[model samples]
Target: AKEVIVYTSNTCPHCFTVKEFLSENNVEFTEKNIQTDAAARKELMKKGIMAVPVIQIDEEVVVGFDRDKIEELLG
Candidate 1:
């Protein structure tokens, strides 16, 4: 089974787009908002991720809003 996690920020519009895409597809996912959650921010920092809209599909990580890659992982 694949698990989807989306790391987002309050000021990032891209993060909203990413979430919308997933929701439109009816794909359930966990959103870790770095702006609101200190733990989530630290977690991303530990991973060396310096950006918002980081997506985790199981063991794979996708940075930004990549539709093809996201679809491939979901598939």
Candidate 2:
């Protein structure tokens, strides 16, 4: 199985949706809460992403909660 990492904030609705989608699909992922982790936020910004729900699958980086794209990638 491939590793999926999600960088998100507590109050982000998109992040919640992404997590729910992954859970519904039985996809396991590492959830990083940027609101409580400054390092995670810095890493996201370093990747030129200023949004919540930044997902990283293997070496691919997604700036938002894109369900279709994530499904395609997972497949």
Candidate 3:
């Protein structure tokens, strides 16, 4: 398995969805909640991402909850 991280905000439903799916599938990930963590928000801004549910699988970045893209990136 590759290293995984998820950047999320509290209000995003898909944030929960992605977290839930990964948890259920036993995918260990480091979560950075932009709503609660300033550093997390800064990292998000560095990436020029203005949305929630940004999943980073190793060097690949997947915006939104595109399960197919996520799966591929994770692989």
Which candidate number has the best lDDT? 1
TM-score of 3: 0.90
Score every model by TM-score.
0.91, 0.88, 0.90
Q: What overall lDDT goes with each candidate model?
A: 0.90, 0.86, 0.88
Models sorted by TM-score, best on top = 1, 3, 2
Write down the RMSD of candidate 3 (Cα, Å): 1.1
lDDT of 2 at 15: 81
lDDT by residue for model 3 (1-75), tens: 898989987798888889998998899999999999999999888988878889888867788999988877766
Candidate 2: stretches off by over 4 Å: none
Clashes of each: 0, 0, 0
Give the range of the ten consecutive residues with the poorest summed lDDT in model 2. Answer: 58-67
Which consecutive 10 residues in model 3 have the weakest lDDT in total?
A: 66-75
Clashing residue pairs in candidate 3 (N, C-alpha, C atoms within 3 angstroms): none
The residue-by-residue lDDT of candidate 2 on 1-75, one tens digit each, is: 778999988788788788888899999999888899999888888888788788898778888877788888998
